[PDB]
Design a protein around this ligand. Structure first.
Ligand SMILES: [Mg+2]
Ligand SMILES: [Mg+2]
Ligand SMILES: [Mg+2]
Ligand SMILES: [Mg+2]
Ligand SMILES: [Mg+2]
Ligand SMILES: [Mg+2]
Lengths: 67, 64, 62, 268, 73, 268, 280
């Protein structure tokens, strides 16, 4: 080999490190977004359960009202 | 050559871990898709019940 | 052995190409979830209103 | 500068629908924390507020490639009075999606028949000075407007001063000066005189505009107006010209956009 | 020239080595981030299922309420 | 309140000199023992520290009438970059003459040509609170700023809270709340969320400002800032937000003047 | 308390070799009958345990003088990240030679240029660590109302080699035990030739709320060969009569219902684990 071979080796290796780093950052962003969306789902399920309660009580009341 | 081999081992481990990352990315993406379809379903049903409850509330307050 | 270096590189590139698509799909999921949140809030609001009206109607026709 | 947008356009007469294709975008400015924005393109028709067509959101790229296609089923007759809108948006999870850029295309200038594909600059929806002396003699009815000097004019520069005299929205008199080439601040010192009776002195418009000279199309650097319905240093200078007869009052003025000036002049 | 050249080569060797170590660390962080991401996906998934059951229950209840209101009118 | 000053101003182009006339003063505060001050007015030009022009000293009147005149021989071209200063002084035989008031007039906003005469308020050269909660989750990169409640706001009040997000001196995000009318202490309880990555968390500015609402011109009540280069309870609350993740920390804050805040923000 | 050790250290740049001299030792504790031990010192490069050097055995002295020399043909560049180990052993003719002491010298703290020679106090050698050194990560989720137990095998790492001259072929077997009996039997897909197997496979079990404090969850990572008996790499258990991070993960599963908690666990030998499961 020579210095050219070692230099190209080093270059391609650095390239690999940068690609790896981009992959990493992508995974980090992934985890982040999924977490925030998780909180969003928390409040969604909250509103939904409240809605269910209200609907149930309403249905009971009308059901007792008709008869 | 020890310098070179040490590095070689590193690259092999990185290779394996990268493969596992591939598998994980596939599972991740797939389940994300399926969950997206499910969310679509949820919004369909939720809009349906929204209309249901609006019309029902109007009809209920109509008899008052 | 440049073969292993370039092969590993190709693996990394592939996984990247997977992950960016996954990320975009996740963003779409964020949109859908947000709209679902608004829809759910409106839903429970209408639910409470209808519950009140139902209370009135029960206290009327029974 | 807000980056550019490459798009494609064509019309299908077989299905009677407009085929608007969003290819890609380039050199988009960063609006988010990390140093890169999350762009997605919203495309719709101005005539109808039908649900807007939006591309999928791409994460953290200042050069996003959408290569998406949208179809607006509208005949060729209604097309003439329509307007295409392509606006680039920035995605944010916890706030309002800020607009990166926007672009408007009149559908009467567009030529369908050959496959169109172009790059267009995005613009912001939110979006030099000239000094001269004014002298009015009520007795002689002479108005002496002496163009003194301009400064900090926009480069490409070849500046020259044109002075116009208006009344009730009509452009009566037109004058101009010598052409000073390659100067950041041109010095003229050129006097102009106007025949203005004392009975209409409160109904005249004096409009001084500094322009650029190419052999072609006449460019525009800046323009200012003094007199009726004027405010700021303009009304001040005018009131000084009136209050001080048989004597010239020199003053500086900041160049305004031609749109606003003509909008103020549109009162008549 | 020669000494500096050999030292340069060994230098590049060391640099590439520590670079690969950095890679190992990065793919480890990536690995863990991915794992916890999947965990979150399972949790939020079950939550979405509960949301769906909620919607179904709402639908049936409002169907009954519709029945009662039609029986009252 | 330091009383008012009536003065006259005009420019003589025939002698090329500025004619500044000191008419009188009113409702001047008492600074001496006997219950009345010994006022005299010092007038000069800011551009040149030429010997100051002072009126004669009137003994024991809170409404002194000077009706004096001063001339500053300065051409109209140099005038634009000048500043008129009229300060009212209190005479004391055995000590430094304490200043009653002061007034500064930019010579580029002043309009000469018509005889000016105005009353102006003297000012002193020496010259509400908002409570909210901060929550930052490093993992999700979410910043939850919940505006809780304001108190003791200045009357004329119509209070509403605007929350801004800054970085490196640039104003990135802008949000606001509901408008509570006719309240001394408005209660909002409104939550806001921001997309902030973990790598820039030490370079962000969170600025909460309580403002008054008129239909017009937007008034200002108070403003506070938390984060980078912050001190006092602000830096404390910030450090608590950082040290306590996935949990919101509520805190009160005293409203500061906008000048000082913007001066601290001017570091970039 | 055993005693001190005088040694010499220097580097020959002319031959590119490390010169380690064992001078002597003092005040060594007696472990033999006569009131004095039979000491001998084993010296080797700390980084790689290859080509260890041993001194001659001195009979019945608590102050042995070796005055011996050893040479480690190691370049000067590699030397910096290499440590030296000098351990004092006691010779016994009819049993295992007990270690009296040991001493480690980092080559980044060592300064070459002047011939070094010092006395250093001996210390007690660290006990042998666990052999497996493998770990398995999974998630636990229990909702008390429906009585569902969701065990999701995520991924193992640093598993012990089971095949000859290569990596292993791991697969996860899950047993559910109670009062010593193995009730349910589950297993995963077989990932071949992997140092770190990724499964991401979910399993569910029917466990009532009244017996949640009396159940055993046994996770076992095993190796797969077609021919003959399939051996076992490692196993861990959580639940009833569990200790360590295992009981912690269990308590996290309990304290957090309707939510899955993922955690790592260190693989133990099957003998001790099964011995723990035979309890009560
Ligand atoms: Mg963004
Ligand atoms: Mg030009
Ligand atoms: Mg006095
Ligand atoms: Mg007000
Ligand atoms: Mg012995
Ligand atoms: Mg095997």
């Amino acid at each position: 080999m020579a210095l050219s071979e070692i230099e190209t080796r080093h270059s391609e290796i650095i390239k690999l490190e940068n690609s790896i780093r981009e992959l990493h950052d992508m995974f980090m962003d992934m985890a982040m977004l999924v977490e925030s969306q998780g909180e969003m789902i928390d409040r969604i399920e909250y509103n939904v359960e409240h809605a269910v309660d209200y609907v149930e009580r309403a249905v009971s009341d009308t059901k007792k009202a008709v008869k | 050559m020890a310098r070179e081999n040490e590095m070689d081992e590193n690259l092999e481990q990185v290779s394996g871990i990268i493969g596992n990352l591939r598998h994980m990315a596939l599972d991740m993406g797939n389940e994300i898709d399926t969950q997206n379809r499910q969310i679509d379903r949820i919004m369909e049903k939720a809009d349906s019940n929204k209309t249901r409850i609006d019309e029902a509330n109007q009809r209920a307050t109509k008899m008052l | 052995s440049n073969r292993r270096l370039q092969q590993t590189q190709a693996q990394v590139d592939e996984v990247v190409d997977i992950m960016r698509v996954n990320v975009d799909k996740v963003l779409e999921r964020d949109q859908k979830l947000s709209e679902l949140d608004d829809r759910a809030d409106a839903l429970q609001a209408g639910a409470s209103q209808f519950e009140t009206s139902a209370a009135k109607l029960k206290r009327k026709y029974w | 500068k807000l980056g550019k947008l490459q798009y494609s356009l064509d019309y299908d007469f077989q299905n009677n629908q407009l085929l608007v294709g969003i290819i890609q975008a380039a050199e988009l400015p960063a609006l988010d924390m990390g140093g890169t924005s999350d762009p997605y393109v919203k495309v719709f028709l101005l005539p109808d507020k039908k649900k807007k067509f939006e591309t999928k959101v791409h994460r953290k790229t200042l050069n996003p490639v959408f290569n998406e296609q949208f179809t607006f089923k509208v005949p060729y007759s209604e097309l003439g009075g329509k307007t295409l809108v392509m606006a680039v948006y920035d995605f944010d999870r916890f706030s309002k999606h800020d607009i990166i850029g926007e672009f408007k295309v009149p559908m009467n200038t567009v030529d369908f028949g050959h496959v169109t594909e172009e790059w267009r600059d995005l613009q912001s929806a939110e979006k030099g000075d000239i000094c001269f002396s004014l002298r009015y003699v009520p007795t002689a009815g002479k108005l002496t407007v002496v163009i003194l000097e301009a400064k900090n004019l926009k480069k490409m520069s070849d500046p020259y001063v044109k002075i116009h005299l208006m009344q009730n929205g009509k452009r009566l008199k037109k004058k101009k000066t010598t052409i000073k080439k390659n100067t950041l601040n041109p010095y003229y010192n050129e006097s102009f005189s106007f025949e203005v009776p004392f009975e209409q002195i409160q109904k005249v418009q004096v409009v001084v505009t500094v322009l650029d000279y190419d052999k072609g199309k006449n460019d525009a650097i800046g323009k200012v107006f003094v007199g009726y319905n004027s405010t700021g240093a303009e009304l001040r200078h005018w009131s000084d010209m009136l209050a001080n007869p048989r004597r010239p009052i020199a003053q500086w003025h900041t160049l305004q956009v031609e749109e606003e000036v003509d909008a103020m002049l549109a009162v008549k | 020239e020669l000494e500096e050249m050999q030292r340069r080569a060994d230098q590049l060797a060391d640099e590439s080595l520590e670079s690969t170590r950095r890679m190992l660390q990065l793919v480890e962080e990536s690995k863990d981030a991915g794992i916890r991401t999947l965990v979150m996906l399972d949790e939020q998934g079950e939550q979405l299922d509960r949301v769906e059951e909620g919607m179904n229950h709402i639908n049936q209840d409002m169907k009954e309420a519709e029945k009662n209101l039609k029986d009252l009118g």
